Design an enzyme around this catalytic site. Structure first.
Site, PDB file in Angstrom:
ATOM      1  N   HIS A  50      -9.536 -26.300  22.034  1.00  0.00           N
ATOM      2  CA  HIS A  50      -9.140 -27.107  20.893  1.00  0.00           C
ATOM      3  C   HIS A  50      -9.836 -26.649  19.619  1.00  0.00           C
ATOM      4  O   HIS A  50      -9.514 -27.117  18.531  1.00  0.00           O
ATOM      5  CB  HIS A  50      -9.449 -28.594  21.147  1.00  0.00           C
ATOM      6  CG  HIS A  50      -8.561 -29.248  22.151  1.00  0.00           C
ATOM      7  ND1 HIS A  50      -7.859 -28.540  23.108  1.00  0.00           N
ATOM      8  CD2 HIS A  50      -8.284 -30.556  22.371  1.00  0.00           C
ATOM      9  CE1 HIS A  50      -7.181 -29.385  23.863  1.00  0.00           C
ATOM     10  NE2 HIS A  50      -7.435 -30.614  23.448  1.00  0.00           N
ATOM     11  N   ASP A  54     -10.573 -28.585  26.427  1.00  0.00           N
ATOM     12  CA  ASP A  54     -10.845 -29.203  25.121  1.00  0.00           C
ATOM     13  C   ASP A  54     -11.581 -28.227  24.206  1.00  0.00           C
ATOM     14  O   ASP A  54     -11.321 -27.009  24.253  1.00  0.00           O
ATOM     15  CB  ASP A  54     -11.646 -30.505  25.301  1.00  0.00           C
ATOM     16  CG  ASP A  54     -11.319 -31.535  24.238  1.00  0.00           C
ATOM     17  OD1 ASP A  54     -11.858 -31.414  23.122  1.00  0.00           O
ATOM     18  OD2 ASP A  54     -10.515 -32.454  24.512  1.00  0.00           O
TER      19      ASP A  54
HETATM   20  O1  LIG Z   1     -17.618 -39.425  24.254  1.00  0.00           O
HETATM   21  C1  LIG Z   1     -17.901 -38.285  24.683  1.00  0.00           C
HETATM   22  O2  LIG Z   1     -18.346 -38.048  25.833  1.00  0.00           O
HETATM   23  C2  LIG Z   1     -17.653 -37.101  23.708  1.00  0.00           C
HETATM   24  O3  LIG Z   1     -17.229 -37.659  22.427  1.00  0.00           O
HETATM   25  C3  LIG Z   1     -16.839 -36.679  21.411  1.00  0.00           C
HETATM   26  O4  LIG Z   1     -15.712 -35.912  21.898  1.00  0.00           O
HETATM   27  C4  LIG Z   1     -14.479 -36.651  22.082  1.00  0.00           C
HETATM   28  C5  LIG Z   1     -13.826 -36.169  23.389  1.00  0.00           C
HETATM   29  O5  LIG Z   1     -14.470 -36.666  24.588  1.00  0.00           O
HETATM   30  C6  LIG Z   1     -13.794 -34.626  23.299  1.00  0.00           C
HETATM   31  O6  LIG Z   1     -13.604 -34.004  24.549  1.00  0.00           O
HETATM   32  C7  LIG Z   1     -12.701 -34.264  22.272  1.00  0.00           C
HETATM   33  O7  LIG Z   1     -11.397 -34.834  22.587  1.00  0.00           O
HETATM   34  O8  LIG Z   1     -13.191 -34.779  20.995  1.00  0.00           O
HETATM   35  C8  LIG Z   1     -13.529 -36.234  20.945  1.00  0.00           C
HETATM   36  C9  LIG Z   1     -14.116 -36.604  19.564  1.00  0.00           C
HETATM   37  O9  LIG Z   1     -14.918 -35.796  19.029  1.00  0.00           O
HETATM   38  O10 LIG Z   1     -13.757 -37.691  19.044  1.00  0.00           O
HETATM   39  C10 LIG Z   1     -17.969 -35.667  21.134  1.00  0.00           C
HETATM   40  O11 LIG Z   1     -17.582 -34.709  20.128  1.00  0.00           O
HETATM   41  C11 LIG Z   1     -18.327 -34.990  22.471  1.00  0.00           C
HETATM   42  O12 LIG Z   1     -19.315 -33.981  22.281  1.00  0.00           O
HETATM   43  C12 LIG Z   1     -18.779 -36.061  23.512  1.00  0.00           C
HETATM   44  O13 LIG Z   1     -19.990 -36.707  23.108  1.00  0.00           O
HETATM   45 NI    NI Z   2      -6.530 -28.876  25.959  1.00  0.00          NI
HETATM   46 NI    NI Z   3      -9.307 -33.443  20.712  1.00  0.00          NI
END
Ligand SMILES: O=C(O)[C@H]1O[C@H](O[C@@H]2[C@H](O)[C@@H](O)[C@@H](O)O[C@@H]2C(=O)O)[C@H](O)[C@@H](O)[C@H]1O
Ligand code: NI
Ligand code: NI
Ligand code: NI
Ligand code: NI
Length: 571
Positions: free
Chosen positions: A400, A367
């Site tokens: 990502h 990610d």
């Molecule tokens: O809920 C969490 O543990 C995280 O939420 C946000 O990240 C999401 C995904 O888990 C992440 O790996 C990627 O796909 O982006 C997502 C998003 O930003 O909606 C936070 O940015 C993470 O730091 C974490 O708290």
């Molecule tokens: Ni990936």
């Molecule tokens: Ni993402």
């Protein structure tokens, strides 16, 4: 003009070694290197020192091997590792810029820094840990950490030691030695209840493989002075390998490849992640929530005052890689993240933390490479803003986004500086994401002196997606909406972006008063990229942005803007 702010990064020292870092200026056109002196005697050059100690540096050098016509911004080193010292001794240090023409700058202001005393070595083998298995070593390793005086170093020697969740404590170092593999258990039982991400987060998450979590409290200072080091591996045991399980990289080194899964496919793809989702579902959760909340991250350190991560390799997390929650003074030096393409396996999360630093890292992640989070919605300010990040001398491969701020923008993400980094094959250089319901935003973010090649999607994105009620919100919605402002893109070169979305893409919702403002873009060169798409932007300027081999007819596309400026000449 003398180099500014020579310093030892937090806990970046030993009984025999000290790590130094310093600021490089905005304009490094004439600076080709830096030289380091202890008591006015030369120790060496930043460049050659990095060749010895940085895992990123051989990748950074190779990045320029392709670069004729000198298109790519040449980064400078900002770190130098001093080894072969003696326990408990003071040493003085200065740094000089070295110029193209051979001449040096006046020395920096000096710093004195003292090594530490030789630590109490604690070996986990003395508590019954053994490379087999199936010896599950949770108890042996925990026993070793428990039997730890302040200033200890717990050693995990060569060998593969399966383990469940472990719980660290203040004033210690866990050292994974050459040949050591800390392997995650695949048993959901060895990871008992861990933490809730935010005070307002309703679903409890399990413990990570390595934790610094107080059962009650997140407050910075709950722990203090925690260190994790050594050239060993931390393996989360989360996922099966991909169809092609190993690739050969651009240096000709082997990279592990982990299967890219989703919630409906984890029953096929996971190991630890398979078992934790199956357990969560039989306990009553739907799949969506079981997949999203109940896989163990690799590392979660919460409330820590002074962290130092160094040398170690990260593989195969069941959920996220390294998490810092409500920490102060965190340093990540020379970690190797090899977690492509583990779903949600980001390299390092910084969450409601302050004064953080990442240098010499290699990133190849499932990610985001480096993510910044500050909470979500109205309750967000119950917590510190994510304030103070310095990201330098890293090599970003796949992931990502190299620098991601963050979607979770609640308490504010701010004072972020990403300089002197190289990105190869990464999706995005700078990614700034939010929605209007999350509130907060990101401000004072600088992305400069970076070189990038073969980006898979875009150079920079700043999206702001206004909602609102339209009620589907798991936390209280934000009253004051989200916004990005005061972003600087300077001295940045990209050769090739193989995606199809806009090279630079800014989007808000100006209908609903959601716009970005104060974007300063200076001296950027983009070869073989798609045209830009910039909407909902105010008070911004784009100077000396040169598109060659554009994949389109005109680089500039502007709707719904007020007070910008191209060169600067206006709309
Ligand atoms: O809920 C969490 O543990 C995280 O939420 C946000 O990240 C999401 C995904 O888990 C992440 O790996 C990627 O796909 O982006 C997502 C998003 O930003 O909606 C936070 O940015 C993470 O730091 C974490 O708290
Ligand atoms: Ni990936
Ligand atoms: Ni993402
Ligand atoms: Ni090559
Ligand atoms: Ni593996």
């Amino acid at each position: 003009d003398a180099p500014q702010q020579l310093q030892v990064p937090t806990l970046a020292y030993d009984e025999s070694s000290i790590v130094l870092v310093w600021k490089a200026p905005e304009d490094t056109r004439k600076i080709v290197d830096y030289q380091i002196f202890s008591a006015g005697k030369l120790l060496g050059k930043a460049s050659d020192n990095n060749d010895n100690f940085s895992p990123a540096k051989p990748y950074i050098d190779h990045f320029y091997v392709n670069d004729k016509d000198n298109f790519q911004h040449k980064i400078v080193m900002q770190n130098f590792t001093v080894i072969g010292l003696k326990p408990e001794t003071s040493y003085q240090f200065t740094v000089k810029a070295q110029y193209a023409d051979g001449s040096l700058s006046v020395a920096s202001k000096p710093i004195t820094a003292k090594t530490s005393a030789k630590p109490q070595i604690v070996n986990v083998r003395d508590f019954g840990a053994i490379d087999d298995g199936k010896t599950l070593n949770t108890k042996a390793i925990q026993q070793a950490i428990d039997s730890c005086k302040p200033g200890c170093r717990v050693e995990i020697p060569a060998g593969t030691y399966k383990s469940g969740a472990l719980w660290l404590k203040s004033d210690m170092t866990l050292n994974l030695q050459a040949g050591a593999i800390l392997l995650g258990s695949e048993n959901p039982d060895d990871y008992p209840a861990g933490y809730r991400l935010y005070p307002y987060s309703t679903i409890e998450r399990p413990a990570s493989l390595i934790n610094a979590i107080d059962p009650n409290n997140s407050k910075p200072g709950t722990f203090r002075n925690i260190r994790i080091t050594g050239s060993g591996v931390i393996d989360g045991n989360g996922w099966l390998r991909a169809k092609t399980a190993e690739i050969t990289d651009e240096l000709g080194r082997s990279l592990p490849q982990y299967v890219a899964s989703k919630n409906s496919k984890v029953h096929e793809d996971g190991i630890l992640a398979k078992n934790q989702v199956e357990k969560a579902v039989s306990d009553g959760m739907d799949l969506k929530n079981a997949y999203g909340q109940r896989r163990s991250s690799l590392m979660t350190l919460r409330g820590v005052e002074n962290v130092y991560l160094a040398g170690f390799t990260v593989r195969n997390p069941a959920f996220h890689g390294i998490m810092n929650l409500e920490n102060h003074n965190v340093v990540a030096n020379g970690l190797i993240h090899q977690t492509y393409d583990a779903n949600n396996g980001d390299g390092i999360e910084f969450g409601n933390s302050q004064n953080v630093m990442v240098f010499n890292n290699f990133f190849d992640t499932g990610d985001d490479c480096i993510n910044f989070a500050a909470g979500t919605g109205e309750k967000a300010q119950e917590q510190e803003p994510m304030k103070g990040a310095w990201l330098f001398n890293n090599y970003f491969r796949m992931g990502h986004g190299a620098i991601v701020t963050g979607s979770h923008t609640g308490a504010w993400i701010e004072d972020i500086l990403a300089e002197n980094n190289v990105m190869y094959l990464t999706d995005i250089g700078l990614r700034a994401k939010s929605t209007s319901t999350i509130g907060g935003g990101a401000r004072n973010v600088t992305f400069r002196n970076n070189a990038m090649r073969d980006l898979a999607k875009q150079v920079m994105v700043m999206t702001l997606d206004y909602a609102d009620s339209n009620a589907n919100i798991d936390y209280p919605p934000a009253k004051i909406p989200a916004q990005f402002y005061d972003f600087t893109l300077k001295n940045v070169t990209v050769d090739n972006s193989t995606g199809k979305n806009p090279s630079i893409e800014i989007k808000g919702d100006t209908a609903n008063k959601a716009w970005h403002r104060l974007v300063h873009v200076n001296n950027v060169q983009l070869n073989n990229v798609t045209p830009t798409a910039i909407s909902d932007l105010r008070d911004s300027e784009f100077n000396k942005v040169t598109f060659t081999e554009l994949r389109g007819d005109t680089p500039w596309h502007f709707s719904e803007v007020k007070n910008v400026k191209v060169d600067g000449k206006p709309v």
